[model samples]
Target: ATCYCRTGRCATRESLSGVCEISGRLYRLCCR
Candidate 1:
């Protein structure tokens, strides 16, 4: 399963305590 974000900020969701790189930046993956 996967989650989404915007401008490095997790959308109206809870963080999965995970990290990923997008366009040379890091962002969180929310699962809640």
Candidate 2:
């Protein structure tokens, strides 16, 4: 299977809901 990929700066690349964060970072997938 493949995870989402978009100029992400957060954890979990899958779409929302299934997107549980493993941790935090300087930026987020939704943020950017």
Candidate 3:
């Protein structure tokens, strides 16, 4: 993320005007 950010949205790894609008209910962020 960038500017202002958060976590658990697939962890986090974005920048340059970050965009992780992923509302994924993925196994409840459960790792495989």
Q: Could you report the Cα RMSD, in angstroms, for every candidate shown? A: 2.9, 7.7, 10.2
* lDDT values, one for every candidate: 0.62, 0.38, 0.36
> Which window of 10 residues has the lowest lDDT sum in candidate 1?
5-14
lDDT of 1 by residue, 1-32 (tens): 56664346665555665776877987676655
Q: For model 2, what is the C-alpha lDDT against the true structure?
A: 0.38
Candidate 1, residue 12: Cα displacement in angstroms equals: 9.0
Q: Per-residue lDDT of 1-32 in model 2, one digit per residue for the tens?
A: 44443345434434432333445523223322
Ranking by TM-score: 1, 2, 3
Error at 11, model 1, angstroms: 7.6
In the range 2-32, model 3's lDDT, one tens digit per residue, is: 2433443433343334433466622222221
Off by over 4 Å in 2: 12-32
Task: Give candidate 1 misplaced runs (Cα > 4 Å).
Answer: 6-13
Q: Show where candidate 3 strays beyond 4 Å.
A: 1-4, 10-32
- Residue 25 of model 1, lDDT score: 89
